[PDB]
Design a protein around this nucleic acid. Structure first.
Lengths: 60, 60, 61, 60, 60, 61
RNA sequence: AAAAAAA
RNA sequence: AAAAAAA
């Protein structure tokens, strides 16, 4: 698996990320955690993002 | 699984939530219940939202 | 589980007017006639088979 | 258990149908055959339609 | 299955095809090959198209 | 994936500039760094993770 | 087929 | 959240 090491590196190093959704919308924050189906993305608030809705995850 | 505790905390504490859909539409209400495939969001009425149609779930 | 089946079953077994919003934002209206694992039969003037994968939300209208 | 008898009746009786795609596009033909993932839609020329791209099937 | 014999006939007989995508874009070419998840479409180049992105496959 | 793996392998091994069209019409460009069952790592000025479910087509640029 | 409408 | 842009 490539997801877990990629996402964990971002979380452990607390790098600012952009999550681009499939609808073109760009979410920004830090990766708090993730499982098989979701990523929790945090700024001032934690939100649950469904991977099915994500196109890409990119360091900001 | 991160999904069940995230949703259950929202449900159990009656948090006002925003559910953003993959078509960019924002729904608002409280998480009434959920299962493997759907979330029941209650404002004036209970509406069943398929998780496949959801991009994000956020406290409002 | 399970919430989906009892929610649809009550709408069906009570013949309640519903709106089914599709993921593209089109709103379909009528009554839940029937459903299975993958589809919902929506009865109006003509009865139609709606794929669940295309549905965002089901609500009483 | 509901999808297959529905599609089988349209096929057997050669019912003119509309297949609305998830992008709103409306295809018209009669259902030639179908399997788990696709439907063959017949008009002048026959075309294979992926179910994942279909929203609804309705007699025309 | 009717999908494999449908695609196989197109490939074997080198029939010019239109592949309509879920975003409404129309691709044209010959079916070079396919597997469970993708189709290789040949026009001026060979391109790998994910089936999940495809609405319809039609002889042109 | 007897077609998918050799196609991506050749682009990665040969460091071929690629274009990835997403299902929403947006085109990404870069080189394929690696890929697995669900994602492609695409590298340009940075490495980004692209979900395959969001991809329509991969082609050499 | 808008390197991407914090919706 | 155009009962639906044969694309």
């Amino acid at each position: 698996s490539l997801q877990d090491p990629f996402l964990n590196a971002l979380r452990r190093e607390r790098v600012p990320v952009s999550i681009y959704l499939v609808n073109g919308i760009k979410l920004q924050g830090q990766i708090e955690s993730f499982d098989q189906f979701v990523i929790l993305l945090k700024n001032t608030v934690s939100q649950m993002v469904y991977k099915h809705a994500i196109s890409t995850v990119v360091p900001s």
